[PDB]
Homo-oligomer: A and B are copies of this chain.
Amino acid sequence: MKYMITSKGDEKSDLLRLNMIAGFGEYDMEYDDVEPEIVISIGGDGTFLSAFHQYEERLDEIAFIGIHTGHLGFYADWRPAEADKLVKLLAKGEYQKVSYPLLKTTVKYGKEATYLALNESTVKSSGGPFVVDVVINDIHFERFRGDGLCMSTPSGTTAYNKSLGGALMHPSIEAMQLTEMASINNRVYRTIGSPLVFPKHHVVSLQPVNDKDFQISVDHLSILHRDVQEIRYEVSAKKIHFARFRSFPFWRRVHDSFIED
């Protein structure tokens, strides 16, 4: 089919990319970075996130693969020594696909912008204090004062979410998880403290109390948003598709990354 290969850009990843292109040339495979059906990412999870966001308008028509030239990643979970076997099996194309849930962020002004996250979307304040009202399915839940908030996909839970004390959830669960960053708690301000796990179709809305300027991040991309009226989180109806060429279970991947390999 049509395929493309993105590279981290160091010698190791560029040379592996050139060798995989050469290997693909021995098959009925066309290099096309406009309408690829296979997107191979060579580098780390950061390289993989840029690949996902490069092609997030054609998610339904792409199977993603990650190769880690450094340490094992959660998306770049195949070693460079398997690249030749990868080329072979991608060429035949009878592999299977597994799908992970994604997070949809909607930002409203006083106008609207939507974003897909593969790891998480976070909200912080633009210098001053961060106060927002947290609304769950039109129900006012809490007034949060602190550093900010983080909404994670399931596969995002091993990333920023983990550093904030959130739970790791198996990515077959269609959910999103909200974690707090340094919440103020006394007898004036009061937050739940615990991470919150939301199913599909639940809508978490963040509403400004005073200042309406926020620094909003989506995966690696962080930009200052002004005149914000509302930030809405929900599990996306879209999903990322991976080419499956072996059994590498999520919990083993968690074990290899955090316990021992």
A contacts, CB < 8 Å to B: 71, 127, 136-137, 139, 141-142, 146-147, 160, 162-170, 172-173, 175, 177, 181-188, 190-192, 194-199, 202, 222, 249, 251-252, 254-255, 257-261
Q: Report A132 CB to chain B, min CB distance, Å.
A: 15
CA distance A195 to B261 in the complex (A): 21
CB of A186 within 8 A of CB of B141, answer no
List of B residues within 8 angstroms of A165 by Cβ: 165, 194
Q: Report A254 CB to chain B, min CB distance, Å.
A: 7
CB of A71 within 8 A of CB of B249, answer no
Q: Report A186 CB to chain B, min CB distance, Å.
A: 5
CB of B137 within 8 A of CB of A249, answer yes
The 7 A-B pairs with the shortest beta carbon distances in the complex, nearest first, are A167-B195, A169-B197, A163-B182, A167-B167, A136-B251, A167-B197, A168-B194
With contact pairs A139-B252, A177-B167, A251-B139 given, residues A260 and B160 touching in the complex (Cβ less than 8 Å): no
CB of A192 within 8 A of CB of B141, answer no
CB pairs A–B below 8 angstroms (16 shown):
A71-B187, A137-B251, A139-B252, A139-B255, A141-B259, A142-B259, A162-B194, A167-B167, A167-B196, A168-B196, A169-B196, A170-B197, A170-B199, A190-B259, A190-B260, A197-B197
What is the count of identical protomers in the complex?
4
Closest to A181 in B: B182
CB of B170 within 8 A of CB of A139, answer no
List of B residues within 8 angstroms of A258 by Cβ: 185-187, 192
CA distance A162 to B186 in the complex (A): 11
List of B residues within 8 angstroms of A147 by Cβ: 147, 163, 181
CA distance A21 to B136 in the complex (A): 38
List of B residues within 8 angstroms of A196 by Cβ: 167-169
CA distance A160 to B188 in the complex (A): 15
Closest to A197 in B: B169
Closest to A182 in B: B163
CB of B139 within 8 A of CB of A249, answer yes
List of B residues within 8 angstroms of A255 by Cβ: 139, 141-142
Q: Report A157 CB to chain B, min CB distance, Å.
A: 8
